[PDB]
Structures are given as C-alpha cells and as structure tokens.
Amino acid sequence: KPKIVLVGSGMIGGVMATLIVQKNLGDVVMFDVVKNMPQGKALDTSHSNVMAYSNCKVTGSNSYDDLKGADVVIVTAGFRDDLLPLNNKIMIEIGGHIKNLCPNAFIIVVTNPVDVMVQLLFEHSGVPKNKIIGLGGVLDTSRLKYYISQKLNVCPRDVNALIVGAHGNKMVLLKRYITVGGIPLQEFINNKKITDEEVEGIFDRTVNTALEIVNLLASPYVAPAAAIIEMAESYLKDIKKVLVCSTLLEGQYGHSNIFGGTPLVIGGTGVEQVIELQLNAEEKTKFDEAVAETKRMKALI
Amino acid sequence: KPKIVLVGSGMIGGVMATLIVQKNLGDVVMFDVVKNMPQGKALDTSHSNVMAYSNCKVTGSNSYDDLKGADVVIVTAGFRDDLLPLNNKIMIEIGGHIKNLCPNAFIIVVTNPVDVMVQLLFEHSGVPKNKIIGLGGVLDTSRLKYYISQKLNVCPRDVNALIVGAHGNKMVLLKRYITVGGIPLQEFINNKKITDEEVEGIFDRTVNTALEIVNLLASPYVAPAAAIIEMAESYLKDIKKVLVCSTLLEGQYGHSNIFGGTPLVIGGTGVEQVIELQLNAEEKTKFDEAVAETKRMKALI
Amino acid sequence: KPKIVLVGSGMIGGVMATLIVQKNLGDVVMFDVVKNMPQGKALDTSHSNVMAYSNCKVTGSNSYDDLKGADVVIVTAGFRDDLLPLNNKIMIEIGGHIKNLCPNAFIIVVTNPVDVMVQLLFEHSGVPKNKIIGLGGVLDTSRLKYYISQKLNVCPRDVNALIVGAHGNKMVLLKRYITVGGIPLQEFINNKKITDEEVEGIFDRTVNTALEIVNLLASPYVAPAAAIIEMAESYLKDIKKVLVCSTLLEGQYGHSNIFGGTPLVIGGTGVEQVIELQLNAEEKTKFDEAVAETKRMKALI
Amino acid sequence: KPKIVLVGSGMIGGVMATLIVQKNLGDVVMFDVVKNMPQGKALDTSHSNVMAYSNCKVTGSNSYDDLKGADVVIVTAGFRDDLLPLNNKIMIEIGGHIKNLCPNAFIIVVTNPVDVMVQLLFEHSGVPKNKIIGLGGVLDTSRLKYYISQKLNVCPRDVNALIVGAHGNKMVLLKRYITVGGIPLQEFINNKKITDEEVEGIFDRTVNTALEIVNLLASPYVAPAAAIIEMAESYLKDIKKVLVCSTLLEGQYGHSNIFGGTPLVIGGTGVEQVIELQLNAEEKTKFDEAVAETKRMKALI
C-alpha cells in the first residue's frame, strides 16, 4: 500500500487526509510539530474508511521517523521577507529527514512562497530534480477555469487555462491559452457569450482569490487540498496528467537554477516532461517578472 | 440538479460540502447565522469542482429563503440540560422555514442531543415521519466496525455491527449482532483471533470516542460528515441502504411518540422501512435505558 | 430513480448496461425485438449490482410499453443506401412509442448513418429539438485524443480535439483545434515531440478505426458504449459538459433543417447550447462536404 | 503501473478489460490463442480511457512472453469429465509460462471446473499457495444476495451470504449465514417480510442461474467479470476484503491437498487469511459432498 506523509496537519492537511481515504489512495501519516492534534484528526479520519469502502491507515505523528518509506511527501508546514529564514530552517530539517528516510519519495511543497521554498527543500534534501515540485498552477487555474465556466454555463473541467511563472500576485494569466471544450476563448468573446471586460474582471478575481476568501472570514484549504491530491494521484497511479506546477528550470524560458510554474507531466517516475510554452514577447515579459520576484527572495537566504 | 442545504456551516458542514462536490451529488447551500464565513467556505469549495470533474454550485448564505426547493436539509446548527431550550428555539425557527420553503425535503438532524432534537424539528416542521431522521448509528457503528477491523486485519466495511437506542453515552452496542464478512464475531473469538476482553475494550473506546478525540486537541467532524453524506446519498440516489438512524417509533420496541436509533432503509421516498430488531430481554433492557434518557430530556422542553 | 431504456440490446447495449450499473446511474431496460436475449443479459448484469455497491434494476424486454416514463432513451436498433428505408421504418415505430410513452425523454441515436437517422427519429417522435442528439464526435474524437496521447505520453483526457460535420468517412478532423493540456498541438510539432506526418497518419487511423477493428476479427462496442454513457450522464446529472454530437442545425454553419456534428453543451434540460465553431474557409469546405453527404442520404427517404 | 494479464479474451475477458479501464487499475494484456481477436478488442477498449479519465494501456496478444512482470494473471482460457485432460494440458502450458515469466503474480483461475483447475495450475506453476485462487463464491453469492435484496427491497450489497465447498451444482448455500444490514435473515422470516419457501426458491434459482441465463439465449459474463475484478482489486489495492474463493485447504474443514470454496482475506500479499467456518454437522455434510466431487474429478487426471 502506498504511503503518503503529510508534513503539516493543518486545515489543508485535514482535507488531504479526507480525500486520500475517499480515493483509497494510500496509508496516511498526518505529521505535525503540534502535539496531539494530528493524532486526533487521524483518529477521526480513520473511521471514514467505513463509509468510503476504503482501507487506508490514518495515523498522527510528531515523530519524524514516520517519514520512513514514504512514497509521497506533502509539505505544508511553515510560519513577509522576514519569514524566509524561519521557513528555510524548517526546510533544512525536513530535508535531512527526507534524505535519510525516504530519498525516493515524490515531494510536493506548499509552504509559501512556494517557488522559493520548493527550491530550498530540493537543495536541503538532495532528491532528484524530477522528484520535487511546488503547488501553484493547478490551484490558481482552478479559480480561473471555475469563474469562466460559470460565465459560460459549462462544466468547470471543460475550461482549460494556463497560469505560469510563480504562485502569488505576479502569477501570469495567459489569455491566449484559455479554451472551452477545446475551443479558443476568443470565439466565445466574438459570439458575445462573454466579454473582454468580464475576462479581465475574472483575471483580477483569480489573482486576488486568497485575499477574497480571507476577507470573507475564512481561508482557502479545500481547493488547495484537492489540487495537491490531483498532483499526488497522478504520480501514484502513473496517470501522466499535464499539470502546471513549480519545477526546476534547466534552460526553459531562458532560465536556470530557479523553480518556476510551468505545465509538466506527472507520472510514475515523477516529472516525466517539462513543457516549455512558446510564449510571445509580452507573455515572456510577464513570466520573467514573476520569476524575477522568486529570484529576489531566493537571493535573501 | 438536487439541492442540498447545510443549515450550519461549521467543520462538519465544511467536510459535507467537500464530499458533495467530490461525489457530484447536488448543488450546495452552506447556510449559517455567522456572517461571511459560509460565503468564504463556499467560494473555496466551489473551485474544487475542477479537480473533481463535477458541476455543483456551492454558495454561502445567511438568508433562510435559500432553503427554497431543497431536496435535502442537514441541520448541524445549535449551541447540558440547560441547552435544551436554546436549541429548541433554533428548531422552532428552522422548522417554520422548512414548512414554508421545502416541505418535501428529506431532513437529517445532527444537533445534540440528536434523538431529542430530531423529534423537536419533526414537531416544529410538520414534515412526514418518513422524511426526517437523526444521525447516530452510522457514525457510532463506524467506530466499532473500524476498531474490530483493525484487530482482525480486514477491510473496515466488511465488519457489520448495530448500535441502537440513542446517540450518546447510553448507546447500545449489540455484541450478538457483530459479523465479519457475514460471519458471527463469536467464531473469531472461538478461533482466538480476538478476545472477549479486546471486544469489551473496543466497546468502551467506541462509546467514548468523541471524548478521546476532544482530549487529543481536536474534535470529530470528518467521520460525522461522511456518515451524514452516506445517509443523504442513499436518499438522493434511491440506494435503499440499511442504515441505523434515529426515527419515530410507532410501536417498535414497545415504544411510541419518541425517536430512537434503529436500523432502517433509506430510499428515494425517505424512510422506506423501519427494522425492528428481535432483541432479547437483556438487550431490550439496555435499549429501554437509552430511550428513557431521551424521554427524560424531551419532557424538559 | 432515473430510468434508462436501451432500444437495442446488442454488444453496445450490453456494455452500456454494465456501465450504468457501475455508475449507479439509473434503472435499465434492455429492450430488443429478439426474444429472450435481453432478459438473459439483464439477469446477468443485475447481479453485478452487488460488486458495484449499486442499486439499479436491470430488466429485459421485447415489449415497447417499457418505454413508459423513460428519462433517457438510447437507440442502437437497426439493420448501403438500401438500408435507409428499412431503418427509417424502425425509426417510425420507435418514434410513435416515444411520443406516446416518454415524450419528455432525452434521446440519443446511434443507428447508422447516425446523422440521417437522428433527424428521422426527431421527425417521427415529435420531441423538442433540444432533446434528441446523435452519437458521433465523442466517439471519433476519443480515437484521435487517444492516439495523440500515446505519441506524446500524456493522459488521454488531456488531449482535446474536435471532429465535426458527420460521423463516418467524411468526418472533419480539425487540426487547428487540437490541444494538449490546453496547449496548441502546433507547439509540440515545433518542439519535435510529434511530426505533421505522424498527425496525418493518426488522422487516417481515426477515420478508418471501425474498419481496423472489424478487420481484426472484432467490432467496436466498448468505446461507443462509453461515449454514449458520457453523454447520457451529462444529461442525468446536469454536468453541462461540452460534447461533440449530432444536433439540428438552425442557421449554424449556414445550414438549416439538417443534423450535423458540432460541439454542444448537454445539461439537465437537454442541449443547452449549440456551439458554432468559427471555421476558416478550408475547414468550412470540409464541413459542408460532410453535411452534404447527410443531405444526399436524407433526400432518398 | 500494475500489469494485469487476461489469459483468455472471450466475453468475460472483454468485460474485465472494460472494468479495469473504468477503475484505472492497471495496464491490461488481453491474451488469447485466437489470432487478431484480442488485438481488436484491446484497440476498442483502449479508446474508452478518454471517457474514463484513465490511463491504462490495453494491448492484445497471442504471445505468451507478454506475461512478463504481470502483477495479476486471470485465467479464463479453456475448452464433461472428458474435458479434464484437455484443460489440464492448457494449465500445464500456462503454468510453465507463469513460473518463467511472472512467478510473483497473483493468479485467479476461472476455467471450469474451477476447484479442480485452480489446483492443477497451482501444481503446474509452482506459485505459493497464498498467491493462487479460484473464482466461485463471490459470483455465486452475488446471485443469492441480489435475489434476497429484491425480495426485501434493500441495497443488494447489504445482504451478506456465504456459499462454500465448490463452484457448481453442489455449491453449499448456508442459510444460517445470511444477514441483511447485519441482521439475521431469520428475523425477516419471523416478521413475515420473506418466507422460508421464498428463500428455498431463491436457493434453487441461485444454484441454477448459469442454466437460466444460458436458456435465455445468453450466457453469464458480466457478473463473473465483476466478481473477478473485485478479487483482483482487493489484491492490487491491499483492501483485505473478505471474499469467498477457492483456496488450498491445509487442515481446514478436516481436508488437505484439495482446493475448496471458503471465506478468505485478499490483501497485498495475496491470501492473508483463510477463514474456517464453524459449520454444524449437517452443513459440514454438504461441504464434504461438494469437495468430494472436486476430489473425484481431480483423481481422474
């Protein structure tokens, strides 16, 4: 049975464990530095195996040895430049344990700013570049896809969209790469089913969604968890989905030695392909600005 | 598209909305008297439609008119005898809205003490007796089934067990009615795969599980949500599952005018059958004690 | 519980009934003019409810009254111009029963040539134009999507493609409308991950797939059944998927009074939108040739 | 990705491949000695990956080397005592290839008479006794469970029942071990929801179901395929379901050196437990008669 370790058992961790049991994906360790809490969540979640017809062990842990033999490790733990050293320390610690205990794990990093933190954990863990990625594009594009789908009254999954560069305020929303049922969004604009102005409003809403939800006396954890589990499941079941995630750039987009958000393929060997978009000059300028902010923060460590 | 209204958008409500989207079961209204919070949770949850390949609207509301045309209403709202009047007031209010806005809804009550509150909402809403039930047995038995399954190393769902009478400390764990893969538990005791003492320990753990989880710096909401959605789904898809829930007793077990936990069948018309267990005298004594506590609290309203 | 009637219980019908039970989608009537056969298939299939955790009645019938109250009707029955009158007779008979017994059903026609037969059944049944469609594009594009996905080593569903006009040898494969993870196929050609020549080979293979399978001592029924059930499920669950199907053209593509393959949206009210592709002149010429063959055969009835 | 090889690509094989793709369970090889046919079925089935959101390779083969690295092997190939030598020859051939090419595979045998043939393949393949079982109980009990569920108007899966000894006319239907929602069937008889006479009629129908379906101008393959895939999935996902299958008896029921139908647990290591029912004397007499027929035929090889 696959073993999935959640390093961080906050709200996102809770939904992830719930979904893993629903999908019968693997045994789950809910790890956290906070005592008792993950044990309680794990106990609650384990009972849902009955309703789900599943058989996944769900355990809680404050003990790093439970990383042993993990097939997937998802890192949400962490404490705005002033947070960079603190969270780097966490990545140092986690990285050591990964190298010691599950060097062959597929690693998904969520800790913000994710495009910096994923590279830090890469550096501190020594795992292969095809075995560690950051959450970004699957989540951000889920917002864009959903809002467009509601304007056009179609199934959310039938909207495809790419958001690249970085996860955060400089995320690059590529209008040219939006399709609906495989059809260019521009055709729907031409047919007056949606306007350019509605699309720009949706772009603004997408960039600011975390803020919107925070201001609504909540915080995002359901969709982040679902995005992470889509990525993890594509690895565990070798589905080879095309998913936009943060990955090491080795020449793509003219960049090296930095992680950035780009479409890639997740299969049973990890990142099987990194897909380099043929961005035009203006799109490329936006991509470069996103990654430049990642570089700026990386240089501060 | 079916419409499911969650009256109460706390932790249990959050997991319920998540699961409804995963299962593509229906549009969801997350209702709460707390402003903004359900709107935030609903917005977050709606994005997960993309990952789930679903198309369920998820909206938040502080407005009771959103009960209009609900097919299923799940009540978790509410504020230990001294809480009975307070929560009764809530049931009065909700009941009026149900009668006005969704008199044909299937109603699942969770507010504790559930066996009292479900009858109060029945009385204040005027819905048919086959259209309103309380959460209890599916949740409690999920604990018992799970713990036994881990002792015997089998799939949790392959353990069947009945817990009856009431949801709470007087719940009746019927040892005679435990089976594993359809086989009496006694055969596994005879074969020394599990002992009577282990089973009694598991009974104690089952009764006190909420307390265990609360003491572990958490609180149960994942398994409660999964239990509720199993009940709701059996109604919405006319599955006719046998599920132990709190229902109006009309002569069964010698009781009338009171709700108690018993196996029943949930299908597209609501409670299609109430199954009366042929309890022996000792089991019956325990059942009567559970329901007597429900009567005691009902008499205080 | 939804009621799905399969008018025709051959191989495609068998797989459809199997999938409906797996998905717990509705009660199934397997209708056929051949005595006993559908009763046997239905009996076999009904047992699989146990393995699937479903509760769908599956019955066999040689009796047209079992169309009564059908929510979905799928027509595969039928006996190459010389077959047109014969199959028209079948559509006359079925049409009468539909009008009498399930005038509100959503109708999916498969009988070939489907773009002619769907219009004949429309004419003989009197159902609204938004409530009857023909199988074509979902099946044909499943071939194109699959073959491209195997060249590029990605999840089959992540390839999107449109095939329009008609189902049969004149089907129009729109190279410009192929995307992979939302990205234009041309980018993958530019990057030498696939060539124009491979794509043309795949186009030829797609057009001739039925012939390939027939020559391999088989015949296609699994993918046709899966395509039909994807369409039916989008209706039954109001998913509003964008699916390419044969539908009445009322001005789109400059055509009237004829059915043709085009992207459309299937939701709970039937065809909720017909999407008119903004074809260029060359693409339009191919579309017109496909539909001209449909017109030619329609004129022979 | 797990690899599942179907040795035999007839009707049962076709449904198995279909279900494996629906469940995204693994790559599939459809093997058959008949040329071209499995290649055609495999090609058809592979396209359904698009509709299922799956990524399973489906290939056809007449070449035994495609057994290499199989995780699961399902044997339906084979040509009434006079058929025993013929089918034994097939088991000799297959057995050699298994030992050579996939000695660690989990093997499910279907070829009739299954309780004899599974032991022959065990003997000719050299695989461990916990890694090879025969289809019987899951299929037979699916009939019994389904028919009882329709009498009582409950979800089919909520009926549990055990049928033991052998698969065929001497199958032992254990009335004492039938439960409904975990409740003894006898309670439903006492309450006049079903009679002893109805139950005996259902027993007769269960024993003779294959004959019923054959006489209805069909033959059973959907439910057999679903039963086999339930067994295979319990292995592949380590679910540890309790499933009644044919397995080597090593003292259980007083028998040795023979395979018989009994509840057992299927998990990731194969047969993890063989559960010996505590049969009473009369039940035991019936069990012995079933297994005696298996012994009689085994002695003829």
Author numbering:
A (entry chain A), B (entry chain A), C (entry chain A), D (entry chain A): 4 to 82, 95 to 316
Pull text from the paper.
The dissociation constants of the DNA aptamer pL1 for the recognition of P. vivax lactate dehydrogenase (PvLDH) and P. falciparum LDH (PfLDH) were found to be 16.8 nM and 38.7 nM, respectively. In this study, we determined high-resolution structures of the pL1:PvLDH complex and apo-PvLDH by X-ray crystallography in order to understand novel ssDNA structural elements, ssDNA folding and interface features for specific pLDH recognition. pL1 folds into a hairpin-bulge contact by adopting three novel structural elements defined as a T-loop-like motif, base–phosphate (BPh) zipper and DNA G·G metal ion zipper. Therefore, pL1 recognises PvLDH predominantly via shape complementarity between inflexible regions and many bridging water molecules (bridging waters).
To understand the conformational change between apo-PvLDH and pL1-bound PvLDH, we determined the crystal structure of apo-PvLDH belonging to I222 at 1.6 Å resolution. Conformational changes are subtle between the apo-PvLDH dimer and pL1-bound PvLDH dimer, with an overall root mean square deviation of 0.94 Å.
